[PDB]
């Protein structure tokens, strides 16, 4: 009888159940240990010197710290350009203002909101979420093509009179809303934005088109980031300070290890055609009989 490995696998049973935690002690998942695995019959050696654990903890520290050192770089850039201009900032966002108004207290509230936002930074925030489309698959040719289409010459009448017809006035902006009447900070916020054609400033609405109405509230402050990594930090009254976010003091494979945007493969219920309207999810559920 050439008896199968499956029956001796089951009848050999499982030795013991051992649970384990993660490093941050957030999840706690359990591990089985079957005796009839081939894990036993390879005769593995095992050892852990402490210097390797120290280097492992340092590498894991870097992997956790890449986001917060990016946020610290953002704060340093804010303070750098705020020292650089000399304290005089323009209004880059459309809001009607009054002249007789106390403005030193708005500066105090702006410093307060800046310290509060630095206290409550997280990996689920503006710059990380705006960075995730930049790490994608077709980002290189898309940015190259947008650069070439931006840097195209003035068209001659030949391509206007016989060539093909020519051709994104709104942008997908990401926002961190902080607020000091309640010390409530709001992290993952999406804002549709474009220019006001009557002037040269920006108009910020919802995806529904709400005309986002926190800018008139005197206590909030917002951080805006654009997909081309342009930077904005807007105190009430429409005045704001601008920069570029600088990530050049950071490694590349750390940025791809941490929050590189995901690419999916084909499972059941998915179109082998690329990009049609898919049907519903597979949805293996316990409410129904599982069929």
């Amino acid at each position: 009888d050439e008896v199968a490995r499956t029956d001796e696998w089951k009848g050999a049973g499982v030795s013991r159940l051992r649970e384990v935690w993660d490093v941050q002690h957030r999840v706690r998942l359990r591990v089985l240990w079957y005796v009839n695995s081939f894990w036993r019959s390879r005769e593995l050696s095992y050892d852990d010197h402490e210097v390797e654990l120290y280097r492992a903890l340092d590498a894991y520290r870097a992997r956790i710290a890449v986001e917060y050192v990016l946020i610290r770089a953002v704060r340093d850039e804010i303070y750098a350009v705020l020292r650089r201009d000399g304290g005089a900032l323009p209004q880059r966002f459309a809001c009607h203002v009054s002249r007789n108004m106390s403005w030193r207290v708005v500066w105090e509230l702006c410093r307060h909101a800046l310290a509060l936002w630095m206290d409550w930074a997280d990996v689920r925030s503006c710059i990380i979420k705006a960075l995730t489309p930049r790490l994608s698959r077709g980002a290189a040719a898309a940015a190259q093509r947008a650069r070439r289409q931006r840097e195209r010459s003035a068209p001659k009448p030949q391509e206007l009179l016989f060539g093909p017809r020519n051709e994104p006035a709104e942008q997908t902006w990401y926002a961190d809303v902080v607020r000091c009447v309640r010390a409530q900070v709001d992290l993952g916020v999406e804002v549709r934005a474009a220019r006001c054609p009557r002037t040269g400033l920006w108009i910020v609405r919802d995806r529904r088109g709400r005309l986002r109405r926190w800018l008139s509230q005197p206590e909030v402050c917002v951080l805006y980031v654009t997909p081309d990594l342009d930077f904005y930090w807007v105190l009430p009254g429409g005045f704001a300070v601008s920069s570029r976010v600088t990530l050049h003091g950071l490694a590349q494979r750390a940025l791809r290890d941490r929050f590189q945007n995901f690419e999916a493969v084909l499972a059941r219920g998915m179109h082998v055609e690329a990009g049609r309207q898919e049907p519903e999810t597979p949805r293996v559920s316990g409410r129904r009989l599982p069929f």
């Binding site: 000399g86 304290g87 005089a88 900032l89 323009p90 209004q91 880059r92 966002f93 459309a94 809001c95 009607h96 203002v97 009054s98 002249r99 403005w103 030193r104 500066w107 105090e108 410093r111 002037t199 040269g200 400033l201 009254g237 429409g238 005045f239």
Partner: peptide, 18 residues
Amino acid sequence: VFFEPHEENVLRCPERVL
């Protein structure tokens, strides 16, 4: 009474005491 926003209106530094 108010003011219409512009690209040339500037908020100054708060008298360098803040």
